[PDB]
Amino acid sequence: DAEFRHDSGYEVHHQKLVFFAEDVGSNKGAIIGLMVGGVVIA
Amino acid sequence: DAEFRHDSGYEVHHQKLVFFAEDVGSNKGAIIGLMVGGVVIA
Amino acid sequence: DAEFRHDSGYEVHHQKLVFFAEDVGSNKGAIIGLMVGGVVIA
Amino acid sequence: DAEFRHDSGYEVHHQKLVFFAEDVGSNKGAIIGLMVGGVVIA
Amino acid sequence: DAEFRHDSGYEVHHQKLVFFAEDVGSNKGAIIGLMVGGVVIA
Amino acid sequence: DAEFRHDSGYEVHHQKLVFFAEDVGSNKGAIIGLMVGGVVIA
Amino acid sequence: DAEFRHDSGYEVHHQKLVFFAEDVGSNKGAIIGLMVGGVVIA
Amino acid sequence: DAEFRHDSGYEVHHQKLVFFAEDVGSNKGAIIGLMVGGVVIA
Amino acid sequence: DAEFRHDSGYEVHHQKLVFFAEDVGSNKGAIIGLMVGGVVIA
Numbered sequence: 001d002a003e004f005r006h007d008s009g010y011e012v013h014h015q016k017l018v019f020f021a022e023d024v025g026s027n028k029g030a031i032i033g034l035m036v037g038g039v040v041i042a
Numbered sequence: 043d044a045e046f047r048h049d050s051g052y053e054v055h056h057q058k059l060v061f062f063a064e065d066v067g068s069n070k071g072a073i074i075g076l077m078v079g080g081v082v083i084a
Numbered sequence: 085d086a087e088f089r090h091d092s093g094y095e096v097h098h099q100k101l102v103f104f105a106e107d108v109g110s111n112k113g114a115i116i117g118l119m120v121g122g123v124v125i126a
Numbered sequence: 127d128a129e130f131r132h133d134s135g136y137e138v139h140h141q142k143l144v145f146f147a148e149d150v151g152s153n154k155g156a157i158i159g160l161m162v163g164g165v166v167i168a
Numbered sequence: 169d170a171e172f173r174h175d176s177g178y179e180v181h182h183q184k185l186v187f188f189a190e191d192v193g194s195n196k197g198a199i200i201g202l203m204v205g206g207v208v209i210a
Numbered sequence: 211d212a213e214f215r216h217d218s219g220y221e222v223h224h225q226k227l228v229f230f231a232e233d234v235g236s237n238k239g240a241i242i243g244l245m246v247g248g249v250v251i252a
Numbered sequence: 253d254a255e256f257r258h259d260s261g262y263e264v265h266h267q268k269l270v271f272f273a274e275d276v277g278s279n280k281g282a283i284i285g286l287m288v289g290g291v292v293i294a
Numbered sequence: 295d296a297e298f299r300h301d302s303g304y305e306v307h308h309q310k311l312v313f314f315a316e317d318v319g320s321n322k323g324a325i326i327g328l329m330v331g332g333v334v335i336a
Numbered sequence: 337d338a339e340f341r342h343d344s345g346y347e348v349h350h351q352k353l354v355f356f357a358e359d360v361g362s363n364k365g366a367i368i369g370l371m372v373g374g375v376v377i378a
Contacts (some may be wrong), residue, residue, distance in 0.1 A: 006047060
């Protein structure tokens with residue numbers, strides 16, 4: 001189980017997420033904010 | 043299970059997410075905000 | 085399971101998401117905001 | 127399951143999402159806002 | 169399942185999404201706002 | 211990715227698949243053999 | 253990734269799959285043999 | 295990753311899979327043989 | 337990672353899998369043989 005209770009007044013979120021792929025040949029991956037339950041298979 | 047309870051007053055979210063793919067040959071991946079349950083298969 | 089309860093007053097979301105694909109040959113991927121349940125297969 | 131409850135007063139969303147495909151040969155991918163359940167297959 | 173409940177007063181959405189395809193040979197992809205359930209196959 | 215390499219000599223497949231829907235009011239579903247990649251959304 | 257290498261001499265497959273839906277009101281589901289990669293969303 | 299190497303001489307598979315749904319009101323599910331990579335979301 | 341090397345001479349598999357759903361109201365689940373990598377989300 002997983003419950004996510006978020007009670008709040010005056011909230012600020014600053015998410016910044018990035019990647020630099022130079023000289024690559026192949027990429028496998030996932031990049032997101034705020035995922036509710038579940039998985040990623042790489 | 044996964045419950046996502048979000049009770050709020052005056053909320054601010056700043057999500058910034060990016061990637062730089064230079065000199066690449068192949069890319070596999072996913073890039074989003076706020077996903078509700080589930081998965082990604084890479 | 086996945087429940088997404090979002091009760092709110094005065095909310096601001098700023099999502100900015102981008103990628104720079106230079107010198108590429110092939111791309112596989114997905115790029116969105118606010119996805120409700122489900123998956124991506126890469 | 128996936129429920130998406132969004133109760134709100136004075137809400138502002140700014141989504142900006144883009145990609146720059148230069149020197150490419152082939153592209154496979156999807157780019158949207160606000161998708162309600164489901165998947166993408168890449 | 170996927171339910172999308174959106175109760176609201178004074179709401180503003182600004183979606184801007186674009187891509188620059190230069191020097192390309194081939195493109196496969198989809199680009200939209202606000203899709204209600206379902207999938208894309210790339 | 212998904213590769214399906216099937217090299218064979220003297221092969222026999224017997225698929226039999228059926229369903230009995232009695233006293234039903236509503237049906238949602240799909241029923242097939244040998245599907246090459248992709249998904250079903252129910 | 254998923255590779256499926258099937259090298260064979262004298263092979264026999266007997267798949268039999270069925271369901272009995274009596275007194276039902278509603279059905280959601282999928283029923284097949286030999287699916288190559290991908291998913292089902294129920 | 296997932297590789298599936300199946301080298302064989304004289305092979306026999308007998309898969310039999312069924313379900314009996316009596317007095318039901320609602321069904322969500324999937325029922326297949328031999329799926330190559332990927333997932334099911336229930 | 338997951339590699340599946342299956343080198344064989346004279347092989348026999350007998351899979352039999354079933355379920356009896358009586359007096360049910362709701363079902364969520366998946367039922368298959370031989371799945372190559374990946375997941376199920378219930």
